[PDB]
Design an enzyme around this catalytic site. Structure first.
Site, PDB file in Angstrom:
ATOM      1  N   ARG A 124       0.822  -1.200   0.000  1.00 29.48           N
ATOM      2  CA  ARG A 124       0.000   0.000   0.000  1.00 29.48           C
ATOM      3  C   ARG A 124       0.865   1.263   0.000  1.00 29.48           C
ATOM      4  NH1 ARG A 124      -3.714   2.287   4.749  1.00 29.48           N
ATOM      5  NH2 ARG A 124      -3.607   4.373   3.793  1.00 29.48           N
ATOM      6  N   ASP A 171      -8.947  10.098  15.472  1.00 30.10           N
ATOM      7  CA  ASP A 171      -7.603   9.939  14.955  1.00 30.10           C
ATOM      8  C   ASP A 171      -6.786  11.218  15.062  1.00 30.10           C
ATOM      9  OD1 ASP A 171      -5.565   8.377  13.928  1.00 30.10           O
ATOM     10  OD2 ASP A 171      -6.639   7.861  12.110  1.00 30.10           O
ATOM     11  N   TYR A 194       3.437  12.121   1.720  1.00 34.80           N
ATOM     12  CA  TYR A 194       3.230  12.746   3.017  1.00 34.80           C
ATOM     13  C   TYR A 194       3.946  14.092   3.079  1.00 34.80           C
ATOM     14  CZ  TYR A 194       0.901   8.738   5.049  1.00 34.80           C
ATOM     15  OH  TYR A 194      -0.067   7.805   5.345  1.00 34.80           O
ATOM     16  N   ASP A 235      -0.918   9.696  16.609  1.00 37.75           N
ATOM     17  CA  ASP A 235      -0.140  10.013  15.428  1.00 37.75           C
ATOM     18  C   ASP A 235       0.506  11.364  15.614  1.00 37.75           C
ATOM     19  OD1 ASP A 235      -0.871   7.660  13.876  1.00 37.75           O
ATOM     20  OD2 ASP A 235      -2.812   8.574  13.474  1.00 37.75           O
ATOM     21  N   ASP A 242      -8.965   4.704  16.876  1.00 37.88           N
ATOM     22  CA  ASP A 242      -8.510   3.968  15.706  1.00 37.88           C
ATOM     23  C   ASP A 242      -7.579   2.805  16.044  1.00 37.88           C
ATOM     24  OD1 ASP A 242      -6.017   5.428  16.146  1.00 37.88           O
ATOM     25  OD2 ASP A 242      -5.673   5.486  14.000  1.00 37.88           O
TER      26      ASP A 242
HETATM   27 MG   LIG Z   1      -4.073   6.905  13.651  1.00 39.00          MG
END
Ligand SMILES: [Mg+2]
Ligand SMILES: [Mg+2]
EC number: 3.6.1.1
Lengths: 281, 281
Positions: B78, B152, B89, B120, B115
Site C-alpha cells: 500500500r 484519529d 506525506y 499520530d 482507531d
Molecule cells: Mg491513527
C-alpha cells in the site's frame, strides 16, 4: 535518441549525462530531431530534471555533444529550494532539441530577445521522467516568463504515452484535467528564485498560457533559428559548441566526437546536503 | 530507542525495521519511553514515513516487538497516492510510543471510538526523517481528525534539534513560521484516501488546530489507555502483541524476546511501481 550514458556520480561536479543513439553518444542539443512526427507535431523532448527533484540540470551548450550537467555558480552546485507547497520542480523539466532562442532577435508582443538556449518544455504527465530521457510529447500551450529583457518561453506539453494524452489537445484541457496546475506553474516560476535571494519573476500575457497554435508558432520559430545556427549562418554563437555527429553537411559535423566520450561511470549518487530538504515558506 | 535493524529491501513485502537499543530489538510500540524528558515535555517520536514518500509504513501492532512493516491491501503493498498540490506525506509522519487510541470507548470530543493505534504525530521540521528513527520532539498542537469515522488525533510537533525549535512553542507559532502548513494539513488528511475510493475524512472543531495544552491533555489520555492495555487490563486488546523487553511489571515482559529476532539483512530499496508517481487532481 535512444539511451543515456552517465559520467560521474550524480549530485557531483563531475556529473554529466549523454544521450546515446544505438550505443553511441550524440549531441543532445543538435542530433536529436525536433520532430518525432512533424506532420502531427509530435516532438522529441530532452528531459533534464525529473519532477519533484531539486538539482538544477541543463544541457550545456558549451560542452561537446552538449551533455546534461548540473548548474553551478562560483564553483557550487545549484539547487532549486522547496517553496511551499511545492517539492522541488513540479514538472518534468526539459527542452526541445534543435531549437534555439536567438538573442540577436526580439519579440514585440513580448518586447524581449531570445535567451540563447533551447526552448524550455514543461511535461505535465503522471510518470516522473529521467534525466537524458527522450520522450515523445505534444504541445498543449505556452507561457512567457520575462527574465530581464529576454522572453523565457515554457511550452506546456504532455507525453504521448500518458493515459490522459488522447483527452488533451489544447491548453483549456489542462484546466479540465489538471485543475490548479497552471496556477501552480505560475506561482512556482514567480517565487522559485526568492529563496536564493533573487527577486520575484515576471510573466507576460499576465500569466496567461497561450494556446497550442501559439506554442507551435514559437517552436517552429526557434527551430528555424537553430537551423541557421547549426548551418554556421548565425550572427553570434558565442560559446555554443555546435559539434554534432548526424548532420553530415553542417560545418561542425564530427563523428569522432562521439568516440571521444569516456565510458559510463560506475558511481553511486553523491549524497545531497540535508539543507536541501528545507521547505521555504 | 537507539538504532535500526532492517530486514530486506524497502518497498518490498519482506521489509521490516526493528528499533534497537544497544544493538538489540525492543518493541517500537511498548519499549520506547513516551517521554525523553517528562519535566520539559520532550517526547520520543517513532518515525514511520519520511516527508514526501508514499509507502504506508506502520508499527505493526500484532507482530512481536512491533517492527515497522509496509501496509498491504488484498496482499499488495500500500502506497498513499499524490494528491495535487502535494507529494506523498507532507510531514515526517510517526507515532508516540506507549499510547493508544482506545477503540473500545467513544471519545467525547469526536463522538467516535479510537482507531486502535498509537497517537499520530506530524513532525514539521526541515530535515526529512527516516523510518525507525526515534527523535525527540515537543508538542505544538493537535487536530481532531475523524479518519474513516474513527477518532484519529494528529499531534503537531517539532524536532528538538530543528533551528526553529526555540521559536516554536505553541500552535500560533506554526502559522507564524509555517504559513499555510496547517491549512494544507487539514486538507491533506481530508483527501488523501479519495484516490483509494474512500470518502473525504472530517475533523472536529472544523479542523481547528487546538493548542499545546490541549495536545498534552489528549496525549495523556492516550498514554493512560496504553498503560491499561499493556497491563493486560483492556476490555479488548484487539489481538495486539504486547510483548516487551523493558517493562518487568507487565504479564508479557520478556527480555529474551529480543534475542529471537533475525539479524539485519539490509538490501537496496526495491523499485516502486511507476503508477505511484501519478498526481491526482
Ligand atoms: Mg491513527
Ligand atoms: Mg529558456
Amino acid at each position: 535518441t535512444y539511451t543515456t550514458r552517465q559520467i560521474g556520480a550524480k549530485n557531483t561536479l563531475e556529473y554529466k549525462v549523454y544521450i546515446e543513439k544505438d550505443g553511441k553518444p550524440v549531441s543532445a542539443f543538435h542530433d536529436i530531431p525536433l520532430y518525432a512526427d512533424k506532420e502531427n507535431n509530435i516532438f522529441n523532448m530532452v528531459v533534464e530534471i525529473p519532477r519533484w527533484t531539486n538539482a538544477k540540470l541543463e544541457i550545456t551548450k558549451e560542452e561537446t555533444l552538449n551533455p546534461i550537467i548540473q548548474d553551478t555558480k562560483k564553483g557550487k552546485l545549484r539547487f532549486v529550494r522547496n517553496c511551499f507547497p511545492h517539492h522541488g520542480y513540479i514538472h518534468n523539466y526539459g527542452a526541445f532539441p534543435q531549437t534555439w532562442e536567438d538573442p540577436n532577435v526580439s519579440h514585440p508582443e513580448t518586447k524581449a530577445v531570445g535567451d540563447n538556449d533551447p526552448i524550455d518544455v514543461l511535461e505535465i504527465g503522471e510518470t516522473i521522467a529521467y534525466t537524458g530521457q527522450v520522450k515523445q510529447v505534444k504541445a498543449l500551450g505556452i507561457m512567457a516568463l520575462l527574465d530581464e529583457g529576454e522572453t523565457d518561453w515554457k511550452v506546456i506539453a504532455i507525453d504521448i504515452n500518458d493515459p490522459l494524452a488522447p483527452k488533451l489537445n489544447d491548453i483549456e484541457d489542462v484546466e479540465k484535467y489538471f485543475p490548479g496546475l497552471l496556477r501552480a506553474t505560475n506561482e512556482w516560476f514567480r517565487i522559485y528564485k526568492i529563496p536564493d535571494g533573487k527577486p520575484e519573476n515576471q510573466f507576460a500575457f499576465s500569466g496567461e498560457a497561450k494556446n497550442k497554435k501559439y506554442a507551435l508558432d514559437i517552436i517552429k520559430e526557434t527551430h528555424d533559428s537553430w537551423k541557421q545556427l547549426i548551418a554556421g549562418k548565425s550572427s553570434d554563437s558565442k560559446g555554443i559548441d555546435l559539434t554534432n555527429v548526424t548532420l553530415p553537411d553542417t560545418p561542425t559535423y564530427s563523428k569522432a566526437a562521439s568516440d571521444a566520450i569516456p565510458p559510463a561511470s560506475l558511481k553511486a549518487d553523491a549524497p545531497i546536503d540535508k539543507s536541501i530538504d528545507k521547505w521555504f515558506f
